[PDB]
Amino acid sequence: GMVEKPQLKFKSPIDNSESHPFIPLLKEKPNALKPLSESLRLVDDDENNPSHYPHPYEYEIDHQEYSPEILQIREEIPSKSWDDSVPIWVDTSTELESMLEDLKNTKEIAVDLEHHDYRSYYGIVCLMQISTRERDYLVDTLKLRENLHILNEVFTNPSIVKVFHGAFMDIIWLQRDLGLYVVGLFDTYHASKAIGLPRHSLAYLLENFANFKTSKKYQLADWRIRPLSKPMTAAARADTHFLLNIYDQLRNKLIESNKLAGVLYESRNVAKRRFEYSKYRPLTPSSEVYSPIEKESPWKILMYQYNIPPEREVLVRELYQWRDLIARRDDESPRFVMPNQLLAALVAYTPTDVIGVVSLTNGVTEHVRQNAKLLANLIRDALRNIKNTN
């Protein structure tokens, strides 16, 4: 079909202006050790790190003690039979409340998410998967975008282990879109590395410990689509359905070889990762902070040198900045507005009228088609400025 942009239905409108450092969406702060008061303040310009808000749960992540049953080798619990249950679809505040009540009665849960970034500037969390020893949950993070914050009661309860595989970006996505934080994380990716398994991916773990073969024929899928297709519903359920059992085996092996403390340390730091706008990103790019990383051509004159002439970097740069502004304005990804190959195509052929712009041998996007005149003017200016100057 066409898929209507889910953003249009968000309770709170999106803001890509980036006129202030990221502000935590957190209004309440359960399992608090340090009041939310001190949390929402600021950290005035340093030199390495410009002004910004700190991670609202950083303190707890450092002080909150782990569940004593995590340091103990325990009899593992096999994953429940896939066919013995259906994944529980959650898309109403009432369904959300019941799941929540259920999660509060666990010792650990497995969590994962599905994300979308083609038709959104920063990106949007489209689905959340949660598994208990007994059931698999599929949460519509689109329809419940503003309600999900209540999961912090469990996501920040240090008495409940939250298991994720390589959650470095998921931690970022969770705060940015849902204002969710995690205290009591166990990252199976770091567990796999510490133990020294040949491969460290989720698929590798699923294949060898749960005899489940994965199909990456969905990491390019569109998670905004409602209802979810059977195959996508299954592939999402598979992210958390087998994870707690894998958690048991890796944990026991870590205790058995005295490496658990290191994995918990690595995990606390994954959970401490803070999301910030590229504009207010710290100088030295560290793993402690994340800011939007262009998924396309090198800022300005690209290295994909489509034989990019000398005096055309000004043109290149204007196209880049124009693209970014339109992307931000319409809340779209830069590639949806204009992919590097098209941008490159414009710079290479330098069309100066609408006909030239829309008939580019390569092809054209809706945005380029709708701004053909502006682009033809922009390009014409670039050429005129060249013929002059020198």
Ligand SMILES: [Mn+2]
């Ligand atoms: Mn994930």
Ligand SMILES: [Mn+2]
């Ligand atoms: Mn997935």
